[PDB]
Amino acid sequence: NRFTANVRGLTQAARNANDGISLAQTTEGAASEVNTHLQRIRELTVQASNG
Amino acid sequence: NRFTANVRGLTQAARNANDGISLAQTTEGAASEVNTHLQRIRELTVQASNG
């Protein structure tokens, strides 16, 4: 009984951790796109810093 | 006569003990089903504990 409970709990834990990985993946992808936006903004800032 | 009375009593006692075995079996089956439930509640609690 104890082993069955532990096994089901740990399988559900693996599912939860996979969900966490997927959430981190989405957040990281959006952050990378924001990173590209910051890169482009810095490019424009360097261009327009000229007189 | 004492032997006969004791023999009939012991046989009827064996029948009573068989009934006790069956009662314990029914209780054991019901408890096993409650256990199978509790595993599912535990797994779902682990699942929903994820934020």
UniProtKB/TrEMBL annotation, chains A, B:
It comes from Achromobacter sp. MFA1 R4. This is Flagellin. The chain holds residues 52 to 102 of 559 of the full protein. It comes from the Bacteria.
